[PDB]
Ligand binder design. Structure first.
Ligand SMILES: Cc1ncc(Cn2c(C)c(CCOP(=O)(O)OP(=O)(O)O)sc2=O)c(N)n1
Ligand SMILES: Cc1ncc(Cn2c(C)c(CCOP(=O)(O)OP(=O)(O)O)sc2=O)c(N)n1
Ligand SMILES: Cc1ncc(Cn2c(C)c(CCOP(=O)(O)OP(=O)(O)O)sc2=O)c(N)n1
Ligand SMILES: [Ca+2]
Ligand SMILES: [Ca+2]
Ligand SMILES: [Ca+2]
Ligand SMILES: [Ca+2]
Ligand SMILES: [Ca+2]
Ligand SMILES: [Ca+2]
Ligand SMILES: [Cl-]
Ligand SMILES: [Cl-]
Ligand SMILES: [Cl-]
Ligand code: NA
Ligand code: NA
Ligand code: NA
Ligand code: NA
Lengths: 525, 525, 525
């Protein structure tokens, strides 16, 4: 067998059947004779390729496979890799290298010092020392991406390797099963359970790894048993809990003092599947107030090490959430009462308040919709106004890197063909990966893109006003016609300049058989 | 003085007056109180920011300053940095970091292990250990970018550093002059000159560092004195010689055997300002035939070390070209005869042959036009058909990374406001940095963009046919309306479906007062 | 509180009370006011410092703390770090950096790009961005070293940080508990147990992480229940099983074909706490024969990913070994019969055969002795001839790096003051870290060093004979007087030129109240 044949057999035996790519010449020998049982999803720029694969991996809860072109292709994807690192997305990034005979002379398209290029944003990065090692290196990439804590990996392959003979002993790679589905030993788990049972006023904080593990329902049972309020850890990349459940208390503010104040009076705070914590703004104060102790369950040693407070347990979130939910006592305390519904903001017949947009989406979207967010000045509103009952219903860029939601919404919609995906994206953010629209058109992936057009990088204007920073350049983005951009890439386009038009456009989009972009004129901040 | 004030004084004293950027929150304290004497050029995605700055630096022959947002902003620019590395572009890339107080906890937008992120594509990469060190670190970045061999550098700055007090001894940085304008010692230069004077059939090969040094005219004098044919080294990022001078012989094929065959019978081959060599295709054979010896003058130790043949001298290209041109004897051999003009390809009233497009550009463009190329299947034709008399008249992506020419053409046009820039970009390539169009619209930088629309990644289809590679996916890019994309970003748009319309559209574009995109329907390969 | 006071409080609260070091000027501000409750163990060269700390950590089963001087001190320790990486040794390596005010100018003793220096041999490497971050960074170092898979970490600290004010919120670091004591979820553990219970001819292979976890006794119970033979995985850094237990089958040969042949006919092979596998010699063949399947339990994702065959489970070795030993059925198969005692090699009244030396050590040493090995040509003999009943009874360099056993034997003896440590070290190996002897003298740590003097790098001579490699230089090491070297560093020295003198010297050494070196004249290979 050839290295090409052996590698595609390994991929299919490990459950991979789709290649997200933007091709180049070092990849032609890999892509030739492309197997009939695989699909290839083309995107026009590499941030788009990796963003689509990332949404696909996060929603499917399995690894996604990417093929990029040498150093420049890899480099164009590195902002996307920053997000994938922070979301623990299991991405297998492959890039083609020059033929081994011309690496030394640094021929055009040689990826120099290749394994160092994506660092520090990957768990593992490697170029094999011979062609026959390629299947084994690919096996290592598959398992490194997939083991907890999941994350992106990188493999560089010289283009001449694919046609070489494989090692016949590579067959032992095909069916390897590798598990990290582990939980705390019985004695120490009993100690933890006793501490939870004994708490007088416990609180629960959940992060994205809960949704990645599909541990949401177990966390619902855990919060019901403990009769405990549930927050979402700050800078949330996913939604880990039904947002209208009586225990839900919303997204935590991303500040040290704000969080310790919120948790004041809670004697035990159990954090599951989050860093402790992904603060953002500078809000100095106490990490916890007196009387509060924190216990973190995380799948990631790097999270456990860097927490500035609390105890930690490094284990699988699915296994731990299931065990805790089934072991704790039913508390006799009263179940928390549900948060009140948000107020209706006054809306005239002009430009839309973000609050109006979210209320209208919530009124009109299916109960199993999936939302993406890259409208950063409106995040708090979005979290208050969308009822998200089910797992896998929210994604936003985990490292703050713009250009995620537009392509990721296409990959999520590919992963969940029966759940309507609705991406809510600011006018500034929409440009970073605008070419991803073409992929939705070409493959008829029926994502709805809602562009919040206020003409500015609104959150930066806000922060600048806060800092009392005068004379900051570069904060306005006038003069972009998003309906023309959508036309450019083959996506049906609608405009909503007021509420009547928003409702009409959403009705049209929801009925449509293909992707739709709605440009919404929103109020300037 | 503050670190902010001291750093902008250092920049202005070192000749920097423009910031190419896409802003974020870690950069607001740098950008606040932006000095009245500086300009800020916004682009909507970081590959575009760096591509614009790169064209500006290459055409201006001085360093360009870039400000990006943390890890994701830096990562989105890394494909652009791959090209800048191979073109020796003097780019000072700065990125904002989180406040020092929250780096440890890895708050959102912390750039982790920051200096390793852009490696291996930068000459120097650093994050200072204290706020007062920031001006000195910026000084190091300026000189590292600017010293031969020029190249990109990276500096990460925590956002809280800018408001801190500067060291008063930082004033010694402001007026430092650092020179690398050096040439081979007299004794060994005399040996070199004697070898050139004695050669019976010398040849000259020129690379991009000749154009970067503005050594073109000296190389003309050198070739006239030696009566020697002149080629351009393969995979040429710039044009180093007038393309209708009698000595000019065109772009070398990027193959080992092809080059040794071309040079056969030339006893001494003098290479100036190029790697030896930037081969691309696999074309195995002899590096040089018997009877040919090679001597390379390069500004880059890494080029001298990796050449597989020949002697080398590491020195400044401007200083060496000037000295050689003024020291060699006038040979009594006959001056080489000019290459014949290219043939006119038969053209019907339908889709345009690339040859027709280039002949028409050459007929209609000013004699001081500047061209950019990211239409890779038509490069050989372009080089044969455009008379480029002057320095600084051609740019193409030096590492093969697409998404360079569109933004770089805007930076070149900003650098050379009296020279009409015309970028010839394939339909595939145009998408990578499509959002850069907005910058040309907003600042009214009157670049002309000629999109060669053949519906496919034509060069890859060609290579696949060569490899006899069947069933390669992802090679076609149907369904893109480039006039709509241009409308989307505010750029006037024209279409040319035949020669009559091409001529008309070019006449309109050349007269226009702003940027113009022409979508040309070209023949499918 | 100062950063100095806060950091020593964090260390003591996390159980650290000893600093292994070789001091320099960047470390004086850390070492000043050294706390009365801490000890400092000086060694004269940094490979010795880290080797002593490594033996101490491995035997104590807890992290050891090291303080080295800047880049040169760190660099001198990097071979020692290679071994620590492969043995999963929890080492906290700190190095002093220049004052922040002179880092920029690269004053003498600046550690440039410090965090990159020990890569790739550390789990985590870091330099803090401010003085107040130092305690948090130290907390991260402690937990990164200590979490499974354990390993070395590196922290660089500018010398001016220690006297600065600490953050009062650093107190939340002091009592953090972080656990990785996890095991496979119940459902999948039941599947594993059923597979073991059902096997017709199971085999067990144990590696060093079993001994690190003190899982030895549980593995004895597991092998007794399954009635299964037990091997030690190749290139063994520790002994994980009593070597005269009836199930014990010895050290596996470090070859692909040799191992698959050994395992032929075993239907299920359970590997615990080892890489799969640490092969050494090139011995190509099948990874496993038909009919054999392999299941690996490892604490290290990097081991699970790179195994070329078998399934894997990433979990804590102590927790998994305990659970398996207590869950499996008692098999009705007959218990394996003990290996026969090794033969007595003929010995004349001249130079000693290695076999004689090991038999005499086994006759004379206490039953709770601890052995170290850096006599590589005699390893197989050593493993056959020493009855090691207890855990923690054997150490050898896990990455093959010489200079480990001499200093490590001093740290093991410091960790286990009531167990006589006996290091058996070749004449070649003894030189690498010869200065470590001084530490044993100064602190009166009563390690016994047995130098096997055959005048040559015997294993290399052997391999060269195998390769039929003629004319290899540098394989002989004549002319070293080890009794004089021991005198040089204050250690009592004895010589044994024959068996009578070996017995006498061992009797004297075993009674001695301090360290003793015995130079043994062994037969030339
Ligand atoms: C790749 C990248 N570049 C720049 C930024 C900085 N950035 C930028 C430019 C923002 C503006 C978002 O503008 P928008 O129009 O999408 O939304 P709002 O108007 O709601 O702020 S928010 C932010 O952090 C970033 N996060 N990521
Ligand atoms: C950043 C990046 N991604 C992918 C490629 C691979 N690539 C690709 C996709 C090419 C197709 C260019 O298509 P085009 O339409 O611009 O021009 P032609 O039709 O003349 O080939 S040429 C080439 O090397 C690349 N060079 N750089
Ligand atoms: C730090 C280092 N340098 C060199 C070697 C190479 N090496 C060397 C030099 C060996 C010779 C050991 O000689 P010895 O006298 O200690 O023992 P033998 O005579 O039993 O081989 S075994 C081996 O792999 C090494 N393993 N580690
Ligand atoms: Ca409603
Ligand atoms: Ca906006
Ligand atoms: Ca003409
Ligand atoms: Ca094309
Ligand atoms: Ca005996
Ligand atoms: Ca020896
Ligand atoms: Cl257990
Ligand atoms: Cl001179
Ligand atoms: Cl379980
Ligand atoms: Na009202
Ligand atoms: Na990198
Ligand atoms: Na014709
Ligand atoms: Na005998």
């Amino acid at each position: 067998a050839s290295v090409h044949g052996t590698t595609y057999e390994l991929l299919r035996r490990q459950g991979i059947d789709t290649v997200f790519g933007n091709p180049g010449s070092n990849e032609l020998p890999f892509l030739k004779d492309f197997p009939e049982d695989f699909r290839y999803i083309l995107a026009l720029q590499e941030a788009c390729v990796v963003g689509i694969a990332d949404g696909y991996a996060q929603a499917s809860r399995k690894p996604a496979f990417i093929n990029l072109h040498s150093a420049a292709g890899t480099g164009n994807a590195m902002g996307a890799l920053s997000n994938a690192w922070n979301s623990h997305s299991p991405l297998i990034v492959t890039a083609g290298q020059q033929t081994r005979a011309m690496i030394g002379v640094e021929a055009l398209l040689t990826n120099v010092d290749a394994a160092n290029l994506p660092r520090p944003l990957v768990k593992w990065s490697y170029e094999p020392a011979s062609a026959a090692e390629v299947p084994h290196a690919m096996s290592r990439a598959i398992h490194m991406a997939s083991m907890a804590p999941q994350g992106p990996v990188y493999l560089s392959v010289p283009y001449d390797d694919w046609d070489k003979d494989a090692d016949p002993q590579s067959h032992h790679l095909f069916d390897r099963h590798v598990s990290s589905s582990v939980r705390l030993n019985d004695q120490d788990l009993d100690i933890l359970v006793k501490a939870l049972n004994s708490a007088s006023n416990p609180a629960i904080v959940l992060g994205p790894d809960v949704d990645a593990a599909n541990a949401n329902a177990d966390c619902v049972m855990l919060a019901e048993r403990l009769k405990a309020p549930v927050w979402v850890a700050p800078s949330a990349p996913r939604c880990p809990f039904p947002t209208r459940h009586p225990c839900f208390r919303g997204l935590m503010p991303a500040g040290i003092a704000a969080i310790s104040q919120l948790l004041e009076g809670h004697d035990v705070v159990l954090v599951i599947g989050a860093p402790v914590f992904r603060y953002y703004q500078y809000d100095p104060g106490q990490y916890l107030k007196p009387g509060t102790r924190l216990i973190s369950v995380t799948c990631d040693p790097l999270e456990a090490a860097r927490a500035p407070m609390g105890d930690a347990i490094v284990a699988d979130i699915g296994a731990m959430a299931s065990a805790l939910a089934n072991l704790v006592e039913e508390s006799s305390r009263q179940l928390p009462t549900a948060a009140p519904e948000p107020a209706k903001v006054d809306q005239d017949a002009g430009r839309l308040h973000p609050e109006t947009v979210f209320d209208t989406l919530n009124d009109m979207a299916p109960e199993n919709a999936i939302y993406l967010n890259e409208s950063p000045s409106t995040t708090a509103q979005m979290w208050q106004r969308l009822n998200m009952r089910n797992p896998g219903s929210y994604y936003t860029c985990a490292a703050g890197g713009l250009g995620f939601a537009l392509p990721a919404a296409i990959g999520v919609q590919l992963a969940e063909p029966e759940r309507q995906v609705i991406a809510v994206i600011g006018d500034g953010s929409a440009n970073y990966s605008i070419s991803a629209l073409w992929t939705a058109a070409q493959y008829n992936i029926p994502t709805i893109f809602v562009i919040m057009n206020n003409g500015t990088y609104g959150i930066l204007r806000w922060f600048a006003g806060v800092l009392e920073a005068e004379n900051v350049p570069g904060l306005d983005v006038p003069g972009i016609d998003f309906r023309a951009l959508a036309k450019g890439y083959g996506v049906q386009a609608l405009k909503a300049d007021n509420l009547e038009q928003l409702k009409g456009s959403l009705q049209e989009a929801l009925s449509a058989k293909g992707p739709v972009l709605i440009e919404v004129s929103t109020v300037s901040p």
